[PDB]
Design a protein around this ligand. Sequence first.
Ligand SMILES: C[C@@H]1Cc2c([nH]c3ccccc23)[C@@H](c2c(F)cc(NC3CN(CCCF)C3)cc2F)N1CC(F)(F)CO
Ligand SMILES: CC1=C(c2cccc(O)c2)[C@H](c2ccc(I)cc2)Oc2ccc(O)cc21
Lengths: 225, 234
Amino acid sequence: LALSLTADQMVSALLDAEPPILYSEYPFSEASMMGLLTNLADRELVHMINWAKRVPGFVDLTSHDQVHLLECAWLEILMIGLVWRSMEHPGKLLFAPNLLLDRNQGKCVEGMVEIFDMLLATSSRFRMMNLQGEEFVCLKSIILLNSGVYTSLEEKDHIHRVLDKITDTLIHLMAKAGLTLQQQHQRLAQLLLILSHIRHMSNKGMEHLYSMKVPSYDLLLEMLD
Amino acid sequence: LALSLTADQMVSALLDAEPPILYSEYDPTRPFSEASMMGLLTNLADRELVHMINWAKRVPGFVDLTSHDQVHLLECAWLEILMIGLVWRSMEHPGKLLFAPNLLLDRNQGKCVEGMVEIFDMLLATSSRFRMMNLQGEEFVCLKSIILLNSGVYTFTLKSLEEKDHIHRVLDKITDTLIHLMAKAGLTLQQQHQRLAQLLLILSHIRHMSNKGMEHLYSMKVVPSYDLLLEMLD
Ligand SMILES: C[C@@H]1Cc2c([nH]c3ccccc23)[C@@H](c2c(F)cc(NC3CN(CCCF)C3)cc2F)N1CC(F)(F)CO
Ligand SMILES: CC1=C(c2cccc(O)c2)[C@H](c2ccc(I)cc2)Oc2ccc(O)cc21
């Protein structure tokens, strides 16, 4: 079914599964800032699982594989969401509508400034590319399906065919927007290369969270069913 | 001078710029303890590093960049570049990493350094994913140049805008070069877009492998510095 969808259908279904925008509870210094960001992360996580179950192909996977994809992707997903929300607040991060934070407020946590700077830089790149909400939902799905695909064979083929239809979906949006074939191939490549930076940011994030002192498999295991 | 090149001229130059395959020190005490194996691999990577600078200066667009921006891209890319280099030459050796023609190691020799085996298994999966897709040399040299230009572009006044848009124009030129190679080979436009996307999604795991590698190199306890790379650049 999910392999037999048009560009239009894939977009619609993803536009439909989008979690809602959440609110914080808001000086700071290490403890509270982390507090507010931790809690909001944890609430966003709950909505993430129900969003993933609505990504075409995802539910056709085993619960083992669903869980692994999520334990590898969860912080890339949070981060592309933040970056997407921040696109029209140049030089700030819209954590929540009541928590819009400055490059300068990263200094309130040791090691966080660097992760704000990365994030702000991805936001500006989205703004300059005029990233569309339809392109956003496709990329957030690419991340979900792609960040642990390389780790049975039947499952790998299914994920790779889903990702083929999201490529088609991404190309269709750009053709409908009226881009040339050269402009289409180019914009496809620009958006998928930003995923390597988001992967980078995820890994430096994870690293910085272990300086703080991450969900296990059992965590997500229970939450899917 | 990189925006003048046709697809074929961009491929020609990238093939021509390729570093040679180096050997590991010949007849070290066999078998290895963790230390001596880490000495062999470090000795080899540090030698590969010198050739990588020479290779980097022949990637079209790279010498148009300031020396500061040139070293920033190498700071950010060097381990992803060594790693894609490893997975390509490892392709035709299922379950084996061809570090050198004289240093061919399977998963189990990876266990001889604590933490190395996880990163080993990732490098092995990636080489298999390359085999599975029948990655071509012309494509490989396009991916290796994309890592150099892309990895550090996101962490750069009018100056460094023209550097960031120039890097992006070059990257757009390498994308076109990849499509041309696929269209030339007889792939449909659809298959052309699909194969471009799967090649670029693999760059995201290579970044992952790179950050895990750097994590592991730190754990053990050194890596290229800024100044060092500045020196080799000139
Ligand atoms: C700035 C980034 C990105 C980010 C954080 N909060 C968010 C809320 C909504 C959307 C995005 C974010 C925040 C963030 C986060 F992303 C997760 C957590 N930790 C909690 C995730 N929890 C799950 C396990 C609970 F037991 C631990 C704390 C944060 F400050 N994060 C920091 C970092 F992870 F990159 C480390 O520097
Ligand atoms: C990927 C890789 C290493 C590797 C393997 C596993 C983990 C890791 O962190 C690095 C290891 C290495 C050792 C020391 C340094 I300084 C850099 C790389 O030795 C190499 C040699 C050549 C090469 O092309 C790639 C590697």
